[PDB]
């Protein structure tokens, strides 16, 4: 019992809201408008500013995470590399935004050693996610070092929530992965944008539902209908 | 023993190197055992610890308070000890000294490595209200060779800024190719003497390169002041007047 | 936002090219003021005073290359100027009608669908 | 040979600057021909036909910047032109008199003698 600081009503409310919102944003459930976690957003934007696209061969991931640490996201190096590994696996993640280079894991459950052993770069889908970014598309903010600028939300070109899902940590509130087939999703986007009132049965006509990265069998169209209602 | 470097280095563990108190901790602990500050019983109920160390110089202004926000974080205004003590004397003499007249006394941030401080307006804002920001421009100078390829001599990086990360950031900004004109960087010391030459080529005014490295790198940064600390058991944002009024009250308590 | 950005970029370029086009209109008065000038600031101030110009326009005129003072170059400037005003009218039509907004969205989404869309590895059973 | 080389270099630069100076003489006729031109080759051919110019001179005129069409710039061109003709006259005086040739030789040899000359490590005995 060391600190004896008493008069802490609104300051414990403000500090508690601050630490709770920092949990919810940084280490928890991602956004609607691009479906990407802030760790993931800083991964994609840092690898964009390094220009590590598929025209060049793969680069060492330790340098990318070090530039993430020095510019955008001052947190665990192994956590940033955990996001790197999970994003760059075909079974762990539906459409691999990062294309890697080296041993990452297996469906049996395996991990890479560290960020300085294997290489990575952006795949053909991150260039889609970052096409037309530098053109007053999404407002930047100043980050923790007040010299770098980061994007608030990545300007998506395909809705990545339905594609890749949101795994969630509950501090009361957790969230799940509905994956989707990209083409049926885009057709659903087209039909919603055409008719402002399409019934969800008529979009279950469009969307089957969970397009898993390894395939399965889905039992229950009733729970599917409950979910998309 | 080996503790670290300004480049960013750490000692191995607590069992490799030695330590003791310096000449200032004996000041901080002079006249402690004499009913000076009330003890409390700690977690083992046999040892007694002091609540607050009886200071003999106000150590907030000297060393600053780095802060972790759970909503509330706090900053480092360091100060020169002699001007601080003279400020304490003038506050204890006249109970109403204006903060301009203490900025007459106190310049402001006395860094452990030296720098250049831009902005006396942010300094005045800080020692009036507590919240503010000043600008930290490194001690850089332009030295023109007779040959023609000019010189930027940088000697004083600002408070808690790496050397190695800044020089790697400069070389990267050369190879990020947003602006050119930097020839090379000479890091001409191992541990001794902080004076480092970065070359600007022929036919390039090095004040342009200097302003651009001040814009980009961690060589001229911002630095916030928010003097937040515990008074009477609560955290409060306090001014330079209030810190020294409270310190004078505490030394009156110590002396009595 | 992307359409407004490209309209800003093309509108600034058309503004500069319109300033050079006004320079091509009355070349002789501009030359007469440049010959009567003493500093560059005087020259650009008197051009902006005489032909209602901007700082960008006057800098473009005072940095205009003399080789570009021909009908073989006025043709290229005038054609490119009409093309950029056509692009401005196109982007204003995009910003005026939300139908074409949805159309651009459909087109680029179908481009993505062509470039990537596989089918379901999972079978919906009953 | 070095003096003739620097006379060649300064003479070529003075030739180009003289072509631009003739452009500064009658600016209006040059502008009138550029406005009447259709290709760059036509413009340079008609300028060389009308003011007895060279290919280097006509390329310098058709690449002359319009900001350089001021008395604040004609002063710099005219002063630098007189300075380069003074340098040409100096190098012609060097090429005309072998005394100054020996003088330049003496000066640079004494410069070397200042920069390096030690004395005899060997003693001449008898």
Numbering used by the authors:
A (entry chain A): 4 to 232
B (entry chain L): 105 to 360
C (entry chain A), D (entry chain B): 361 to 486
Cite, word for word, the article reporting this structure:
DNA gyrases are type IIA topoisomerases found in bacteria, archaea, and some eukaryotes (plants [Evans-Roberts et al., 2016] and plasmodial parasites [Dar et al., 2007]) and are capable of relaxing positive supercoils and introducing negative supercoils into DNA as well as performing other topological manipulations. Unlike eukaryotic type IIA enzymes, which are large homodimers, gyrase is an A2B2 heterotetramer formed by two GyrA and two GyrB subunits. The GyrA dimer forms two gates that facilitate DNA passage. Here we present two different oligomeric structures of Streptococcus pneumoniae GyrA-ΔCTD forming an open dimer complex with a 44 bp unbroken DNA oligonucleotide.
The Tetrahedral complex, built from six GyrA-ΔCTD open dimers, was formed by mixing GyrA-ΔCTD, GyrB, and the oligonucleotide in the presence of ciprofloxacin and novobiocin. A negative stain 3D reconstruction of the complex formed in the presence of GyrB indicated that this complex is comprised of six open GyrA-ΔCTD dimers assembled with tetrahedral symmetry, but surprisingly no GyrB was present. Collecting tilted and untilted particles (673,694 particles), imposing tetrahedral symmetry, and masking out the central density improved the resolution to 4.0 Å. A reconstruction with imposed T symmetry, with a mask for the protein, and excluding the DNA density at the center yielded an excellent map to 4.0 Å resolution according to the 0.143 FSC criterion. The final map consists of 12 GyrA-ΔCTD monomers related to one another by tetrahedral symmetry. In the assembly, GyrA dimers are situated at the two-fold axes of the complex and make contacts at the C-gate domains, whereas the interactions between neighboring dimers at the three-fold axes involve contacts between the N-terminal tails as well as interactions between the N-terminal tails and adjacent tower and WHD domains. In addition WHD and tower domains interact with each other. For example, detailed comparison of the Tetrahedral dimer with the closed dimer shows that the largest conformational change takes place at the N-terminal tail region and the exit C-gate, leaving the winged helix (WHD domain), tower, and coiled coil domains moderately rearranged. The Tetrahedral complex provides a higher resolution structure of the open GyrA dimer whereas the Dihedral complex provides the structures of two anticipated intermediates in the reaction cycle. Although GyrB is not incorporated into the Tetrahedral complex, it must be present in the reaction for complex formation and therefore has a role in complex assembly.
